[PDB]
């Protein structure tokens, strides 16, 4: 369905998204510390499907800044 569901709760397209292997919803790669395609692992699960250590406040900060300057 092309649904973005990310830890920033700012679910519009930022230009670089990655799809959860399980729920098939998409996340912003940068919110998960994935800066380019090379940093994306073979297997990938979102934080909802597999809770991980991830900086949620930083994710929100980055996405909110993108929105605030567009």
């Amino acid at each position: 369905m092309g649904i973005i569901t990310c830890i920033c709760d700012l679910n519009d397209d930022d230009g670089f998204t990655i799809q959860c292997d399980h729920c098939n919803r998409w996340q912003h790669a940068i919110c998960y510390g994935i800066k380019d395609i090379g940093m994306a692992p073979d297997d990938y699960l979102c934080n909802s499907c597999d809770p991980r250590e991830v900086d949620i406040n930083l994710a929100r900060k980055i996405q909110q800044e993108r929105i605030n300057v567009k």
Partner: peptide, 11 residues
């Protein structure tokens, strides 16, 4: 993983 990435280029 499966990814989408949009490139924006002017000329």
């Amino acid at each position: 993983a499966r990814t989408k990435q949009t490139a924006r280029k002017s000329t």
